[PDB]
Amino acid sequence: SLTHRKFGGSGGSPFSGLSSIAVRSGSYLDAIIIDGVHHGGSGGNLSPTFTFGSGEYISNMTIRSGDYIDNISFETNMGRRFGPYGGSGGSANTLSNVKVIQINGSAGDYLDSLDIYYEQY
Amino acid sequence: SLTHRKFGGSGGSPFSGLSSIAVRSGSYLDAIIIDGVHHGGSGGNLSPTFTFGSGEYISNMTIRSGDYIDNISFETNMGRRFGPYGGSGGSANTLSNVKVIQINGSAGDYLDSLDIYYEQY
């Protein structure tokens, strides 16, 4: 049962555990790199790193996928953008008016899947 | 509304975006370091970093908190323990039979709050 709980007091500046994203890509996603941690293979080309600003999160995302992840792009709540990186294959799936909380997935030599945890607004 | 969605196919090995945790602490927490990113101040002592292995996640966690986060301890599904680190005051709350997905929070010079996202089993 997916849930969340808050602990502590008021104050401070909000932060997220999801701080940066990069990918390796060609016609598909070879890897995703989350907070600098590599998930997938060594093929494709390494994208620049997107580092979230304070109070910044993914609010819209387009993922093209079939048996693998083919393309990723996203926009943040501050209008910053990442991608598209990857190819033109797969089915396009969009998340809109969300707040992405976490990106998990599965990978081998390529990025097989993503499991995106998010709040839908 | 908190949810998740999977994209892509069935291959590869699972990974998590949450890969390492350390804290800075004294009688309460100065900072939490998530995947190498420092959230909070420079006070206290720096704990060692706990890096999750393949297939490893936080299954039990005890947080002491009041106006601040006072103490963090956790156990993984593989029986590894982090902490306790911090002080002995505040109120204790425990998550048991969970899988922690993400740790967000708020911090200034100190660690004011955490928002923990998790599966409850």
What ranges do the domains of chain A cover? 18-121
Distance set, CA A52 to CA A29, A42, B6, B55 (Å): 21, 24, 23, 27
- Do residues B90 and B112 lie in contact, with contact meaning Cβ atoms separated by under 8 Å? no
Contact at CB, A115 and B6, closer than 8 angstroms: yes
Chain-centroid distance, C-alpha B58: 8
B41 phi, psi to nearest 5 deg: -90, -170
Contact A16 B119 (CB under 8 A): no
* Residues B63 and B29: beta-carbon distance below 8 Å: no
The approach used to solve this structure was: X-ray
User: Cα(B67)–Cα(A59) distance, rounded to whole angstroms?
Assistant: 30
Is A11's CB within 8 Å of B111's CB?
A: no
* Separate counts of helices (H) and strands (E) for chain A: 0, 13
**Cis (ω within 30 of 0) for the bond into B84?**
yes
Could you say which of A16, A37, A69 has the minimum Cβ distance to residue B8?
A: A69
| CA angle (A70 as vertex; A49, A48 as ends), nearest 5 | 10
Cβ atoms of B16 and B119 within 8 Å: the answer is no
- Residues in A closer than 8 angstroms to B96, CB to CB, are none
> Which residue reads 């839908």 in tokens?
A120
Beta bridge partners of residue A2, listed in sequence order: B119
Resolution in A: 1.3
Sequence-distant (6+) residues with CB within 8 A of A32 are A21, A22, A23, A39, A40, A69, A72, A103, A105, A107, A111, A114
The answer to whether A31 contacts chain B (CB < 8 Å) is no
Q: Which residues contact B88 (CB under 8 A, 6 or more apart)?
A: B27, B64, B70, B71
Please give, rounded to a whole number of angstroms, the shortest distance from the CA of A49 to a CA of chain B: 14
**A1, A13, A15: which to substitute to probe chain B, counting the most B Cβ within 10 Å?**
A15
Cα end-to-end distance, chain A, whole Å: 19
Question: DSSP letter at A34?
Answer: E
Give the class (CATH, top level) of B18-121: mainly beta
* Contact A79/B at CB under 8 A: no
Q: Say if residues A109 and A50 touch (Cβ distance below 8 Å).
A: no
Task: Say how many CA atoms lie within 13 Å of B31 toward its Cβ.
Answer: 20
Q: Is the peptide bond before A14 cis (omega within 30 degrees of 0)?
A: no
Three-class SS of residue B90?
coil
Annotate A94-115 with DSSP letters as a single string: EEESEEEEEEEEEESSSEEEEE
Max CA separation in chain A (angstroms): 47
* Angstroms from A84 CA to nearest CA on chain B: 16
Residues in A closer than 8 angstroms to B2, CB to CB, are: 2-4, 101, 117-119
| Alpha carbon distances (Å) from B63 to A44, A90, B72 | 42, 43, 5
User: How would you class B103 by CB atoms within 10 Å of its CB: exposed for 0-12, middle for 13-18, buried for 19 or more?
Assistant: buried
Q: Which residues of A touch B93 (CB under 8 A)?
A: 5, 7
- Which chain A residues are within 8 Å of B18, Cβ to Cβ? 17, 102
Secondary structure (DSSP) of B1-69: -EEEEEEE-S-SEEE-S--EEEEEESSSEEEEEETTEEEE-S-SEEPPPEE--TT--EEEEEEEESSSE
